Swiss-Prot record, chains A, B:
Amino-acid positions noted as binding Ca(2+) 2 in the UniProt annotation, renumbered to this chain: 90, 92, 94, 96, 101
Lineage: Eukaryota, Metazoa, Chordata, Craniata, Vertebrata
Protein's name according to its UniProt entry: Parvalbumin beta
Purpose: In muscle, parvalbumin is thought to be involved in relaxation after contraction. It binds two calcium ions.
Organism for this UniProt entry: Merluccius bilinearis (Silver hake)
Entry keyword set: Acetylation, Calcium, Metal-binding, Muscle protein, Repeat
SUPFAM superfamilies: EF-hand
């Protein structure tokens, strides 16, 4: 696509910055790709893309492949990275990230 | 699209900045949308999008609707704006902008 919510270049840069195992930080990633500066609706659209199986929730397994949703050839997040990511977003402790938790997590 | 060469937000901002008749400046527009920082291939892809009729050249009439290629609801450039734009890019004086002239015009 010629134009989209996020610029391919920013996605590439955000991905490059966290290539090393255990170098991922969601705030840094969101900042670099430009998601933090988007509208609540755009943030929600990102939620649907990450929710690969359309269960209406982002499960730990989808966090593991979080980078791939942005860049198909990206690595999988390590268990430490996925667990920290889940802990950060899972306000209600149910083991997954719902739409409002996602919106709250991105802060936009 | 979730991701693209240019970010919708940057396109919106570049368009907003030149809403007034005769306020357009191609360098400012290219800078704001992020095209100046892209690869020669990405710059060429932009060329194809502007070349609406696929003649392999950007004619004055396509410069007039330049903004619309980026944002469908945008205004048409005034004759003064289109003429200045054409003069700037048309190195060989043939009345149109070819692919190399476009690449040279964007400077990327
Ligand atoms: Ca899911
Ligand atoms: Ca939850
Ligand atoms: Ca043409
Ligand atoms: Ca020419």
């Amino acid at each position: 696509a010629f134009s989209g919510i996020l610029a391919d270049a920013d996605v590439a840069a955000a991905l490059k910055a966290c290539e090393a195992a255990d170098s991922f930080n969601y705030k840094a990633f969101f900042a670099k790709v430009g998601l933090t500066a988007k509208s609540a609706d755009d943030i929600k659209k990102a939620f649907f893309v990450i929710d690969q199986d359309k269960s209406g929730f982002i499960e730990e397994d989808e966090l593991k492949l979080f980078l791939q949703v942005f860049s198909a050839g990206a690595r999988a997040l390590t268990d430490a990275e996925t667990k920290a990511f889940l802990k950060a977003g899972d306000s209600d402790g149910d083991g997954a990230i719902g739409v409002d938790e996602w919106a709250a997590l991105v802060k936009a």
